[PDB]
Amino acid sequence: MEDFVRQCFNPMIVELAEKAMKEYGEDPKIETNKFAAICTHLEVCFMYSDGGSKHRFEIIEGRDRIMAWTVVNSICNTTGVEKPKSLPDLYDYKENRFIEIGVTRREVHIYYLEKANKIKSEKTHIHIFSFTGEEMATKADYTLDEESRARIKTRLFTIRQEMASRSLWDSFRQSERA
């Protein structure tokens, strides 16, 4: 699983994931499923930001915390948008909203509810992907064109396929907590 992560995700993604774990005192060589899941989430965030026209999205996820909030608070000042209680993943300059992205090993509906709740913000839009082609967005507004979504869903499906080929999928699949 460690090896699969290091083989399947760009080294920038792996470095950020390693860092995010060690900031919580977790060792990526031991909590290897969390390692994969962080990497997957970052990957989808980055894919998603490429999905628009360029300049459509600002990436917030993946930044150190000071930079992330610097971006967030700059956008709130510029655009007048309500400042979130916790860091989201992207800002959409076309729809003028923050977006919270989730990638679930469970079911999109439950994950969406947990997110809606974990953040509970009237403002932030939420878009959840599963590894089996499901997707659940705020007000069924899916933000990107269907081709862009399909590339994301295809990447997640390929990851899941590649893990199951190494017998990693069962354990990974079962590792997400409510």
Ligand SMILES: [Mn+2]
């Ligand atoms: Mn985030």
Ligand SMILES: [Mn+2]
């Ligand atoms: Mn997220």
